[PDB]
Amino acid sequence: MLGNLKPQLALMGEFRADPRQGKIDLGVGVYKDATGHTPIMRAVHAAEQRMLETETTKTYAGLSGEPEFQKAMGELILGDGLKSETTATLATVGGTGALRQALELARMANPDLRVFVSDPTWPNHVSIMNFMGLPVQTYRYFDAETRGVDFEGMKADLAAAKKGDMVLLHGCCHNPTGANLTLDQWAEIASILEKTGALPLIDLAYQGFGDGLEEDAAGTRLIASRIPEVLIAASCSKNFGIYRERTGCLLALCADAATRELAQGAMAFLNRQTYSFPPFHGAKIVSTVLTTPELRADWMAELEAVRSGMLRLREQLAGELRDLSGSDRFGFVAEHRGMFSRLGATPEQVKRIKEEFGIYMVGDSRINIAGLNDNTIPILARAIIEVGV
Amino acid sequence: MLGNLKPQAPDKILALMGEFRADPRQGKIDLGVGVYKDATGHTPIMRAVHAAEQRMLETETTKTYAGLSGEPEFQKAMGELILGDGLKSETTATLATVGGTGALRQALELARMANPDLRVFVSDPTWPNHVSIMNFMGLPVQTYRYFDAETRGVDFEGMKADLAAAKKGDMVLLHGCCHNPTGANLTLDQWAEIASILEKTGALPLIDLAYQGFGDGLEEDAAGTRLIASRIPEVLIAASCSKNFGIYRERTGCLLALCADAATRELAQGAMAFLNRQTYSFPPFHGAKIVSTVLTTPELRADWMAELEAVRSGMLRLREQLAGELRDLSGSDRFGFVAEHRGMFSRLGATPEQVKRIKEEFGIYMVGDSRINIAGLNDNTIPILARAIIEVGV
Numbered sequence: 001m002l003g004n005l006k007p008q009l010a011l012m013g014e015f016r017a018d019p020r021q022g023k024i025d026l027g028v029g030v031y032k033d034a035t036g037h038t039p040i041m042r043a044v045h046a047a048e049q050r051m052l053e054t055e056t057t058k059t060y061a062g063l064s065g066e067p068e069f070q071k072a073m074g075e076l077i078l079g080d081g082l083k084s085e086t087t088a089t090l091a092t093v094g095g096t097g098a099l100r101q102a103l104e105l106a107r108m109a110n111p112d113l114r115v116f117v118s119d120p121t122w123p124n125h126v127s128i129m130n131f132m133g134l135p136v137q138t139y140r141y142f143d144a145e146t147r148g149v150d151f152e153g154m155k156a157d158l159a160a161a162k163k164g165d166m167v168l169l170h171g172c173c174h175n176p177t178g179a180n181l182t183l184d185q186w187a188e189i190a191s192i193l194e195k196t197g198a199l200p201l202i203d204l205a206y207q208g209f210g211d212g213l214e215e216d217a218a219g220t221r222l223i224a225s226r227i228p229e230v231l232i233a234a235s236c237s238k239n240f241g242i243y244r245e246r247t248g249c250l251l252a253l254c255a256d257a258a259t260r261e262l263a264q265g266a267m268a269f270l271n272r273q274t275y276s277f278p279p280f281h282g283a284k285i286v287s288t289v290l291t292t293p294e295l296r297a298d299w300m301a302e303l304e305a306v307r308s309g310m311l312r313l314r315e316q317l318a319g320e321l322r323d324l325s326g327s328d329r330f331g332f333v334a335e336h337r338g339m340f341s342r343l344g345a346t347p348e349q350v351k352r353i354k355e356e357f358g359i360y361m362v363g364d365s366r367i368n369i370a371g372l373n374d375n376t377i378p379i380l381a382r383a384i385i386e387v388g389v
Numbered sequence: 390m391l392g393n394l395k396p397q398a399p400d401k402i403l404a405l406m407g408e409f410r411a412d413p414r415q416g417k418i419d420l421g422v423g424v425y426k427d428a429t430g431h432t433p434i435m436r437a438v439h440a441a442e443q444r445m446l447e448t449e450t451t452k453t454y455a456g457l458s459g460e461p462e463f464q465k466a467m468g469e470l471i472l473g474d475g476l477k478s479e480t481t482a483t484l485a486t487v488g489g490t491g492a493l494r495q496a497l498e499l500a501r502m503a504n505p506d507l508r509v510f511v512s513d514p515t516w517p518n519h520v521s522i523m524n525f526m527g528l529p530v531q532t533y534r535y536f537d538a539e540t541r542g543v544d545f546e547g548m549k550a551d552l553a554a555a556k557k558g559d560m561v562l563l564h565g566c567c568h569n570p571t572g573a574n575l576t577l578d579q580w581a582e583i584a585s586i587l588e589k590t591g592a593l594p595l596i597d598l599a600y601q602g603f604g605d606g607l608e609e610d611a612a613g614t615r616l617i618a619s620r621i622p623e624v625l626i627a628a629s630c631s632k633n634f635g636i637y638r639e640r641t642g643c644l645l646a647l648c649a650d651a652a653t654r655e656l657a658q659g660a661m662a663f664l665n666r667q668t669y670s671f672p673p674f675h676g677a678k679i680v681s682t683v684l685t686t687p688e689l690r691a692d693w694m695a696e697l698e699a700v701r702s703g704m705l706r707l708r709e710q711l712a713g714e715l716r717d718l719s720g721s722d723r724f725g726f727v728a729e730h731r732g733m734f735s736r737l738g739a740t741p742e743q744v745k746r747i748k749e750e751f752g753i754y755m756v757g758d759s760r761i762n763i764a765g766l767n768d769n770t771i772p773i774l775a776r777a778i779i780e781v782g783v
């Protein structure tokens with residue numbers, strides 16, 4: 001029967017096929033340092049050395065994840081707003097597993113839900129939704145010309161969200177646009193959600209890559225304080241640099257202790273029916289780092305150095321661009337926050353840059369500024385200006 | 390809206406675990422445990438596993454995203470460990486999964502994709518998780534006789550009669566070895582008959598192989614799977630590294646799809662990768678890397694096999710001791726099946742009423758279906774378990 005299956009990356013091969021020295025791969029989705037490497041964070045390495053020395057068994061652990069991991073992540077994300085008596089926590093297989101589990105959880109509570117996503121959004125969001133058969137709706141977000149947020153459009157579309165519907169919001173560092181909401185915009189969003197009774201699903205995958213650990217969780221913390229029920233899918237892949245360990249977390253904020261129990265039970269059940277227990281290693285690294293003072297101090301230091309480094313890089317790009325353009329048209333570059341940025345260029349311009357200058361971006365013109373370099377910056381700027389973006 | 394979320398039932402033994410703990414009796418015994426336990430009541434980390442992690446600590450340079458279907462090294466090593474030299478790489482699709490449970494879930498999603506009208510056949514009895522998952526998916530479930538309550542062995546005639554009803558496209562779930570919870574297993578000749586019935590019906594076999602190496606040996610325990618694999622053109626294999634590598638919490642499993650031709654292998658491999666992506670994206674690296682390190686490193690594989698063997702042999706001597714004790718007390722050989730059962734578990738065949746009678750009078754705990762864990766026994770516990778069994782009229 002397997003022959004009845006339908007035929008369920010290409011750019012990479014195409015990139016590999018390019019013989020031209022000077023190939024620039026800006027389409028990468030992971031952090032990269034000056035020498036094109038994704039290192040293991042000092043604290044993470046120290047945590048693994050410590051773990052190998054203190055673990056005396058690998059027997060089955062907790063179905064919903066370890067309490068130390070659940071608490072540490074709850075505090076990292078919610079800070080002082082962590083109301084554990086009404087918060088259910090589920091350790092998942094990365095942030096993607098968190099989002100998946102979120103969708104299943106919400107669907108169990110509402111077989112008739114629709115999901116609102118930003119235009120554009122992380123493609124893996126929609127593929128999972130389609131695969132689940134969930135109705136997907138979009139809301140305006142990225143303003144093509146100003147390369148910022150189209151907040152008026154966003155307010156217009158979200159206002160139509162119905163009770164029980166879900167609104168997927170990126171907590172910070174919007175993937176792929178790079179354009180983000182301000183605390184004032186976040187507050188207005190909370191008003192809309194409150195009026196509509198739409199459940200918010202916050203995708204927090206880049207806490208620490210925008211303005212700082214605490215600053216990047218501001219919008220999330222605000223939504224959590226205004227709305228009684230909210231779901232938050234967090235990933236430790238990027239900010240802890242443990243992409244392959246598959247460490248993530250799903251948090252369900254409930255109106256009371258009773259609902260918290262329902263949610264927690266259904267969340268654990270969801271894990272049990274999908275793969276039983278969640279992977280221990282990556283989560284153990286995270287809680288060790290977070291609960292050990294000298295380790296957290298160093299993880300913060302390193303993460304801040306990464307963050308500051310990226311800002312420095314995109315400020316140079318903005319400058320280089322401004323000089324060659326004689327205007328601050330590309331100012332948005334230094335204003336965007338995160339690892340990615342959409343240049344707002346057309347598919348035509350994108351391929352023209354690839355074939356003529358050897359710069360590889362994602363079709364929608366998404367570039368990973370971490371993949372840049374002070375030597376690469378001038379070349380990229382020339383390409384943009386020359387191709388007439 | 391989270392308020393209209395129906396209550397979800399807790400874990401099966403969870404309650405029994407709490408019941409055991411509350412018991413104030415000095416000398417109570419727990420045989421309901423579902424993991425290996427050594428003489429000292431611990432679940433140690435295998436030597437080769439500890440050594441592999443040490444190697445990884447010194448050699449890994451990055452933690453970037455790796456393979457969506459798992460690492461090639463792991464895929465190859467798992468395929469070879471299970472199918473020996475008969476591994477036709479050209480026609481097998483492989484997928485690293487979150488444990489054996491994840492491989493089972495992925496297999497059911499894969500099969501359901503290829504045939505939306507499939508029914509699954511599970512043994513009577515079988516691992517509870519099997520039914521829970523299928524019930525969660527809304528898959529039709531059929532049963533085939535397996536455990537013979539009177540002889541504690543396999544009711545082969547019943548099994549054959551029930552499986553003969555499987556239609557083309559139906560799925561039959563067989564345990565590769567060490568049947569959990571019964572401990573009763575098929576002989577290679579019985580597997581051969583099973584192969585005939587499956588060829589005849591055109592039903593897809595799904596092999597749940599979680600205890601390779603805990604029965605008669607690493608190669609021996611895979612004979613059944615290999616026979617099926619050689620005679621049936623399309624096979625599904627859900628393997629787990631939890632028990633035989635002792636990495637329960639690292640969540641390391643494997644789903645192998647044997648196909649008739651390369652073209653179909655492509656279709657399956659693509660659908661399998663797609664399944665990982667839509668569930669949790671990339672699979673967990675840690676456990677799979679320990680396993681591939683052990684299997685591909687001469688000294689490690691050697692030490693690992695040596696430790697597994699010591700475990701297997703130890704459990705077997707325990708079975709011998711229990712059976713001997715049972716024989717001396719009963720003045721018969723009714724309990725000879727204990728020395729014949731293979732695996733970590735064994736269904737004694739006691740009724741629920743007898744099981745609770747055993748707990749109340751002798752302070753011995755076991756799963757409500759009379760499933761005991763052989764690894765929980767020892768020189769002191771055996772005599773009491775034997776006397777308990779007999780005193781309750783089992």
Ligand SMILES: *Cc1c(COP(=O)(O)O)cnc(C)c1O
Pocket residue numbers: 093094095096097122170175203205235236237238243247248669670
């Ligand atoms: C990285 C990322 C995730 C999750 O990644 P995982 O590898 O599954 O941790 C989810 N959403 C967005 C927008 C991301 O960028």
Ligand SMILES: *Cc1c(COP(=O)(O)O)cnc(C)c1O
Pocket residue numbers: 275276487488489490491516564569597599629630631637641642
């Ligand atoms: C242990 C076991 C599994 C898989 O366990 P995982 O912890 O998910 O690796 C699958 N089937 C049976 C019969 C088992 O005993």
